[PDB]
Amino acid sequence: MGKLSEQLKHCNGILKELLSKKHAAYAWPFYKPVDASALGLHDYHDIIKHPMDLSTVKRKMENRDYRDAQEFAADVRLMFSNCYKYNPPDHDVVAMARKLQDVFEFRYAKMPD
Ligand SMILES: CNC(=O)c1cc(C(=O)NC2CC2)cn(Cc2cccc3[nH]ccc23)c1=O
């Protein structure tokens, strides 16, 4: 019933949408941790100090790690910030990040107060 639980269920809804087939064409680079070794990105962990991905966010939601919506948002935005910091701004992964962030920001804005 409480405000924090209700706001966290909004976040869970967003999370579920970000991982849905509706957004899969652009969301898929954010499903799993960046495997820097597999992708040849041997400078990734020198540039990105706090890696984040939707699977980690989902793990933290399932483990009741997130105490409020603001904590959930900070992880989702960190994932996007990491993409914008590491990747050239003309790489498809950045375009895909932009589109998924647009989904995140517009539904997050509708959070029950
Ligand atoms: C969060 N993900 C990343 O930061 C990421 C970085 C790089 C990457 O190679 N970045 C280099 C600096 C350019 C490659 N991938 C895979 C990928 C994703 C999307 C389109 C693609 N087209 C070709 C590969 C590819 C990612 O998911």
PDB file of C-alpha atoms and ligand atoms in Angstrom:
ATOM      1  CA  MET A   1       0.000   0.000   0.000  1.00  0.00           C
ATOM      2  CA  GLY A   2       2.855   2.434   1.028  1.00  0.00           C
ATOM      3  CA  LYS A   3       4.278   5.072  -1.400  1.00  0.00           C
ATOM      4  CA  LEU A   4       7.798   3.454  -1.787  1.00  0.00           C
ATOM      5  CA  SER A   5       6.316  -0.023  -2.603  1.00  0.00           C
ATOM      6  CA  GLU A   6       3.917   1.557  -5.153  1.00  0.00           C
ATOM      7  CA  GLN A   7       6.753   3.600  -6.771  1.00  0.00           C
ATOM      8  CA  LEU A   8       8.956   0.416  -6.774  1.00  0.00           C
ATOM      9  CA  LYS A   9       6.083  -1.478  -8.598  1.00  0.00           C
ATOM     10  CA  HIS A  10       6.073   1.340 -11.214  1.00  0.00           C
ATOM     11  CA  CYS A  11       9.901   0.780 -11.556  1.00  0.00           C
ATOM     12  CA  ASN A  12       9.293  -2.998 -11.864  1.00  0.00           C
ATOM     13  CA  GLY A  13       6.733  -2.285 -14.640  1.00  0.00           C
ATOM     14  CA  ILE A  14       9.289  -0.110 -16.479  1.00  0.00           C
ATOM     15  CA  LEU A  15      11.946  -2.831 -16.030  1.00  0.00           C
ATOM     16  CA  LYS A  16       9.493  -5.443 -17.447  1.00  0.00           C
ATOM     17  CA  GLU A  17       8.779  -3.138 -20.458  1.00  0.00           C
ATOM     18  CA  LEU A  18      12.542  -2.446 -21.083  1.00  0.00           C
ATOM     19  CA  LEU A  19      13.049  -6.281 -21.267  1.00  0.00           C
ATOM     20  CA  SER A  20       9.869  -6.833 -23.430  1.00  0.00           C
ATOM     21  CA  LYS A  21       9.759  -7.890 -27.136  1.00  0.00           C
ATOM     22  CA  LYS A  22       8.270  -4.404 -27.938  1.00  0.00           C
ATOM     23  CA  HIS A  23      11.801  -2.839 -27.378  1.00  0.00           C
ATOM     24  CA  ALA A  24      14.037  -5.941 -28.143  1.00  0.00           C
ATOM     25  CA  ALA A  25      15.447  -4.524 -31.476  1.00  0.00           C
ATOM     26  CA  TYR A  26      17.221  -1.645 -29.593  1.00  0.00           C
ATOM     27  CA  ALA A  27      17.228  -2.976 -25.930  1.00  0.00           C
ATOM     28  CA  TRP A  28      19.335  -6.165 -26.485  1.00  0.00           C
ATOM     29  CA  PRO A  29      22.864  -4.629 -25.940  1.00  0.00           C
ATOM     30  CA  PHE A  30      21.649  -3.707 -22.358  1.00  0.00           C
ATOM     31  CA  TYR A  31      20.228  -7.208 -21.439  1.00  0.00           C
ATOM     32  CA  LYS A  32      23.573  -8.572 -20.080  1.00  0.00           C
ATOM     33  CA  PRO A  33      26.884  -7.254 -18.689  1.00  0.00           C
ATOM     34  CA  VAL A  34      29.220  -5.926 -21.400  1.00  0.00           C
ATOM     35  CA  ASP A  35      31.626  -8.883 -21.975  1.00  0.00           C
ATOM     36  CA  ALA A  36      34.643  -6.649 -22.783  1.00  0.00           C
ATOM     37  CA  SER A  37      36.952  -9.653 -23.507  1.00  0.00           C
ATOM     38  CA  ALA A  38      34.452 -11.321 -25.928  1.00  0.00           C
ATOM     39  CA  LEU A  39      33.865  -7.970 -27.789  1.00  0.00           C
ATOM     40  CA  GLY A  40      37.618  -6.964 -27.998  1.00  0.00           C
ATOM     41  CA  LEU A  41      36.970  -3.873 -25.723  1.00  0.00           C
ATOM     42  CA  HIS A  42      40.173  -4.323 -23.615  1.00  0.00           C
ATOM     43  CA  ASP A  43      39.939  -0.643 -22.404  1.00  0.00           C
ATOM     44  CA  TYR A  44      36.236  -0.982 -21.226  1.00  0.00           C
ATOM     45  CA  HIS A  45      36.945  -1.524 -17.465  1.00  0.00           C
ATOM     46  CA  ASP A  46      39.642   1.265 -17.578  1.00  0.00           C
ATOM     47  CA  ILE A  47      36.941   3.756 -18.804  1.00  0.00           C
ATOM     48  CA  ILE A  48      33.783   2.334 -17.073  1.00  0.00           C
ATOM     49  CA  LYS A  49      34.239   2.127 -13.252  1.00  0.00           C
ATOM     50  CA  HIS A  50      30.609   0.985 -12.485  1.00  0.00           C
ATOM     51  CA  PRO A  51      29.302  -1.393 -15.180  1.00  0.00           C
ATOM     52  CA  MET A  52      25.460  -1.788 -15.284  1.00  0.00           C
ATOM     53  CA  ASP A  53      22.934  -3.757 -17.359  1.00  0.00           C
ATOM     54  CA  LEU A  54      19.207  -4.688 -17.176  1.00  0.00           C
ATOM     55  CA  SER A  55      20.001  -8.222 -15.814  1.00  0.00           C
ATOM     56  CA  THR A  56      21.838  -6.672 -12.784  1.00  0.00           C
ATOM     57  CA  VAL A  57      18.919  -4.211 -12.257  1.00  0.00           C
ATOM     58  CA  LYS A  58      16.498  -7.191 -12.429  1.00  0.00           C
ATOM     59  CA  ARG A  59      18.702  -9.170  -9.903  1.00  0.00           C
ATOM     60  CA  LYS A  60      18.709  -6.121  -7.519  1.00  0.00           C
ATOM     61  CA  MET A  61      14.871  -5.667  -7.832  1.00  0.00           C
ATOM     62  CA  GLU A  62      14.381  -9.504  -7.197  1.00  0.00           C
ATOM     63  CA  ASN A  63      16.765  -9.332  -4.152  1.00  0.00           C
ATOM     64  CA  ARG A  64      14.886  -6.224  -2.747  1.00  0.00           C
ATOM     65  CA  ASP A  65      18.225  -4.301  -3.095  1.00  0.00           C
ATOM     66  CA  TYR A  66      16.459  -1.038  -4.211  1.00  0.00           C
ATOM     67  CA  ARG A  67      15.058   0.937  -1.201  1.00  0.00           C
ATOM     68  CA  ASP A  68      13.340   3.580  -3.473  1.00  0.00           C
ATOM     69  CA  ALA A  69      12.585   4.518  -7.166  1.00  0.00           C
ATOM     70  CA  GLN A  70      15.533   7.079  -7.200  1.00  0.00           C
ATOM     71  CA  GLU A  71      18.016   4.150  -6.526  1.00  0.00           C
ATOM     72  CA  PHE A  72      16.451   2.091  -9.424  1.00  0.00           C
ATOM     73  CA  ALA A  73      16.596   5.143 -11.804  1.00  0.00           C
ATOM     74  CA  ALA A  74      20.281   5.804 -10.827  1.00  0.00           C
ATOM     75  CA  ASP A  75      21.216   2.236 -11.977  1.00  0.00           C
ATOM     76  CA  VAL A  76      19.214   2.473 -15.262  1.00  0.00           C
ATOM     77  CA  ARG A  77      20.751   5.926 -16.032  1.00  0.00           C
ATOM     78  CA  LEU A  78      24.312   4.661 -15.146  1.00  0.00           C
ATOM     79  CA  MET A  79      23.878   1.917 -17.799  1.00  0.00           C
ATOM     80  CA  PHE A  80      23.017   4.640 -20.378  1.00  0.00           C
ATOM     81  CA  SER A  81      25.831   7.010 -19.131  1.00  0.00           C
ATOM     82  CA  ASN A  82      28.374   4.100 -19.472  1.00  0.00           C
ATOM     83  CA  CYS A  83      27.212   3.588 -23.106  1.00  0.00           C
ATOM     84  CA  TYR A  84      27.562   7.400 -23.854  1.00  0.00           C
ATOM     85  CA  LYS A  85      30.995   7.612 -22.149  1.00  0.00           C
ATOM     86  CA  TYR A  86      32.615   4.515 -23.797  1.00  0.00           C
ATOM     87  CA  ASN A  87      31.124   4.438 -27.317  1.00  0.00           C
ATOM     88  CA  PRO A  88      31.646   6.923 -30.201  1.00  0.00           C
ATOM     89  CA  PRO A  89      28.464   9.076 -30.366  1.00  0.00           C
ATOM     90  CA  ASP A  90      27.756   7.824 -33.986  1.00  0.00           C
ATOM     91  CA  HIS A  91      27.846   4.028 -33.096  1.00  0.00           C
ATOM     92  CA  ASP A  92      24.478   2.152 -33.403  1.00  0.00           C
ATOM     93  CA  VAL A  93      24.697   1.066 -29.689  1.00  0.00           C
ATOM     94  CA  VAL A  94      24.451   4.831 -28.767  1.00  0.00           C
ATOM     95  CA  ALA A  95      21.367   5.312 -31.040  1.00  0.00           C
ATOM     96  CA  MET A  96      19.834   2.170 -29.416  1.00  0.00           C
ATOM     97  CA  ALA A  97      20.677   3.538 -25.901  1.00  0.00           C
ATOM     98  CA  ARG A  98      19.010   6.931 -26.858  1.00  0.00           C
ATOM     99  CA  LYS A  99      15.780   5.067 -27.944  1.00  0.00           C
ATOM    100  CA  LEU A 100      15.661   2.846 -24.811  1.00  0.00           C
ATOM    101  CA  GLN A 101      16.396   5.910 -22.560  1.00  0.00           C
ATOM    102  CA  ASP A 102      13.506   7.775 -24.285  1.00  0.00           C
ATOM    103  CA  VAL A 103      11.236   4.818 -23.229  1.00  0.00           C
ATOM    104  CA  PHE A 104      12.687   4.828 -19.667  1.00  0.00           C
ATOM    105  CA  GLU A 105      12.484   8.652 -19.142  1.00  0.00           C
ATOM    106  CA  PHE A 106       8.867   9.043 -20.407  1.00  0.00           C
ATOM    107  CA  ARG A 107       7.451   6.172 -18.271  1.00  0.00           C
ATOM    108  CA  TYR A 108       9.647   7.062 -15.191  1.00  0.00           C
ATOM    109  CA  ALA A 109       8.172  10.619 -15.437  1.00  0.00           C
ATOM    110  CA  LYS A 110       4.662   9.076 -14.967  1.00  0.00           C
ATOM    111  CA  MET A 111       5.619   7.708 -11.553  1.00  0.00           C
ATOM    112  CA  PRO A 112       2.778   7.842  -9.000  1.00  0.00           C
ATOM    113  CA  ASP A 113       3.386  10.596  -6.341  1.00  0.00           C
TER     114      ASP A 113
HETATM  115  C1  LIG B   1      26.114  -1.627 -23.675  1.00  0.00           C
HETATM  116  N1  LIG B   1      26.774  -2.188 -24.839  1.00  0.00           N
HETATM  117  C2  LIG B   1      27.905  -1.686 -25.315  1.00  0.00           C
HETATM  118  O1  LIG B   1      28.410  -0.676 -24.823  1.00  0.00           O
HETATM  119  C3  LIG B   1      28.470  -2.299 -26.566  1.00  0.00           C
HETATM  120  C4  LIG B   1      29.602  -1.782 -27.137  1.00  0.00           C
HETATM  121  C5  LIG B   1      30.135  -2.316 -28.385  1.00  0.00           C
HETATM  122  C6  LIG B   1      31.359  -1.835 -29.062  1.00  0.00           C
HETATM  123  O2  LIG B   1      31.936  -2.590 -29.846  1.00  0.00           O
HETATM  124  N2  LIG B   1      31.811  -0.590 -28.859  1.00  0.00           N
HETATM  125  C7  LIG B   1      33.020  -0.122 -29.533  1.00  0.00           C
HETATM  126  C8  LIG B   1      33.504   1.229 -29.212  1.00  0.00           C
HETATM  127  C9  LIG B   1      32.905   0.942 -30.541  1.00  0.00           C
HETATM  128  C10 LIG B   1      29.481  -3.348 -28.969  1.00  0.00           C
HETATM  129  N3  LIG B   1      28.356  -3.912 -28.439  1.00  0.00           N
HETATM  130  C11 LIG B   1      27.649  -4.955 -29.205  1.00  0.00           C
HETATM  131  C12 LIG B   1      26.746  -4.240 -30.194  1.00  0.00           C
HETATM  132  C13 LIG B   1      25.589  -3.602 -29.761  1.00  0.00           C
HETATM  133  C14 LIG B   1      24.769  -2.890 -30.618  1.00  0.00           C
HETATM  134  C15 LIG B   1      25.094  -2.764 -31.953  1.00  0.00           C
HETATM  135  C16 LIG B   1      26.260  -3.362 -32.415  1.00  0.00           C
HETATM  136  N4  LIG B   1      26.816  -3.397 -33.669  1.00  0.00           N
HETATM  137  C17 LIG B   1      27.981  -4.121 -33.620  1.00  0.00           C
HETATM  138  C18 LIG B   1      28.195  -4.564 -32.354  1.00  0.00           C
HETATM  139  C19 LIG B   1      27.104  -4.089 -31.547  1.00  0.00           C
HETATM  140  C20 LIG B   1      27.763  -3.423 -27.272  1.00  0.00           C
HETATM  141  O3  LIG B   1      26.749  -3.940 -26.832  1.00  0.00           O
END
